[PDB]
Design a protein around this ligand. Structure first.
Ligand SMILES: C[C@]12CCC(=O)C=C1CC[C@@H]1[C@@H]2[C@@H](O)C[C@@]2(C)[C@H]1CC[C@]2(O)C(=O)CO
Length: 367
């Protein structure tokens, strides 16, 4: 199923990304990356197609591709539904150079399954081109995601874009008057001052006995839900390595209503990731080679993928969360329990309804 494959991609992408930069704050939106690369797969063939879909985790021996795109159409559709549009939006776009014309079926497919806009662009003028697209993404994410492509790209004739924006409200908001500056212990040799939020509430709590960590689950107004995982000091990678469907399943069953003095910091983090190295570690490599099969994009031209970029922002306050994420792919011609989050921790934001991993975080430093 889609929900299982997507989250396994989420955790796998997360684990691999964690290993590449062990001191940086890590914040990503897995569903954005999965929908974008799946939309890209519509224009791929041969070994490139098979390798991509397999990297996203779908078994193309027990599952058709139409089913997959039918699967992402269903999610894209559900993240439009009236009761979630106010708090969540997701969308796709295709930017195309005038020298190229899409095959009827490709442009028809991206419009049917992904509701993608296809917009003409003059890529010969890349300064203008990255300006048009960055603002487009800027606007679609209400200004949270700024300058997605940056000046350090060689020009490219096709750009596939996906964006996600999410604004949730705590069912149990933190106490506004209670926020104070506390110590957040970043390393054994690095200490920072951070705004620490506080609430004393009945909260879902679990001290894990099989893993060196403690965790809480909080819901948002709507269908949003979030996990906060605090590993024991120096056990961050043991908890990350254990992140799977089986662990969160075991956690959900273990979470019990408890009295908690909950201290979480006001996190404002962002991250920019070239997912080239990350994706090829996951086995998605043919896209970038001069043997790339993009024959379903257009009739005549050989296309390869030049760049895959993800950008995401996180804001945490007493009232809620404000998150945004974007992926782009460039193609070229071939008694109360005291729980204190004053050290590195994990954030996992999910949707109760679809189980889509919306946002994953490794907070090394919350400032
Ligand atoms: C592994 C699980 C169930 C089987 C599956 O194919 C995929 C997933 C990924 C998301 C998990 C889900 C269930 O376990 C319940 C979870 C943890 C959910 C994310 C949010 C959670 O729904 C809950 O909030 C339940 O309280």
């Amino acid at each position: 199923g889609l929900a299982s494959a997507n989250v396994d991609f989420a955790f796998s992408l997360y684990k691999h990304l964690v290993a590449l930069s062990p001191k940086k704050n890590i914040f990503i939106s897995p569903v954005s990356i999965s929908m974008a690369l799946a939309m890209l797969s519509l224009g791929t063939c041969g070994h490139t197609r098979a390798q991509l879909l397999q990297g996203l985790g779908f078994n193309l021996t027990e599952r058709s591709e139409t089913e997959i795109h039918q699967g992402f159409q269903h999610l894209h559709q559900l993240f439009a539904k009236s009761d979630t549009s106010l708090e969540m939006t997701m969308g796709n776009a295709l930017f195309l150079d005038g020298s190229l014309e899409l095959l009827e079926s490709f442009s028809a497919d991206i419009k049917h399954y992904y509701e993608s806009e296809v917009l003409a662009m003059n890529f010969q003028d890349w300064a203008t081109a990255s300006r048009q697209i960055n603002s487009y993404v800027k606007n679609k994410t209400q200004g949270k995601i700024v300058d997605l492509f940056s000046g350090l790209d060689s020009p490219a004739i096709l750009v596939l874009v996906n964006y996600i924006f999410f604004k949730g409200t705590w069912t149990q908001p933190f106490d506004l008057a209670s926020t104070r500056e506390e110590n957040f212990y970043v390393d054994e040799t690095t200490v920072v001052k951070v705004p620490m939020m506080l609430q004393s509430s009945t909260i879902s709590y679990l001290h894990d006995s099989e893993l060196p960590c403690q965790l809480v689950q909080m819901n948002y107004v709507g269908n949003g839900t979030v996990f906060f995982i605090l590993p024991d000091k120096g056990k961050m990678n043991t908890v990350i390595a254990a992140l799977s469907r089986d662990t969160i399943n075991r956690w959900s069953a273990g979470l019990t209503s408890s009295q908690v003095d909950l201290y979480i910091p006001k996190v404002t983090i962002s991250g920019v990731y070239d997912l080239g190295d990350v994706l090829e570690e996951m086995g998605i490599a043919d896209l970038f080679t001069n043997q790339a099969n993009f024959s379903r994009i257009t009739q005549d031209a050989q296309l390869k993928s030049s760049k895959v970029v993800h950008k995401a922002v996180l804001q945490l306050n007493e009232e809620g969360v404000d998150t945004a994420g974007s992926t782009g792919v460039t193609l070229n011609l071939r008694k109360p329990i005291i729980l204190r989050f004053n050290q590195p921790f994990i954030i996992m934001i999910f949707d109760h309804f679809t189980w889509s991993s919306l946002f994953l975080a490794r907070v090394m430093n919350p400032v």
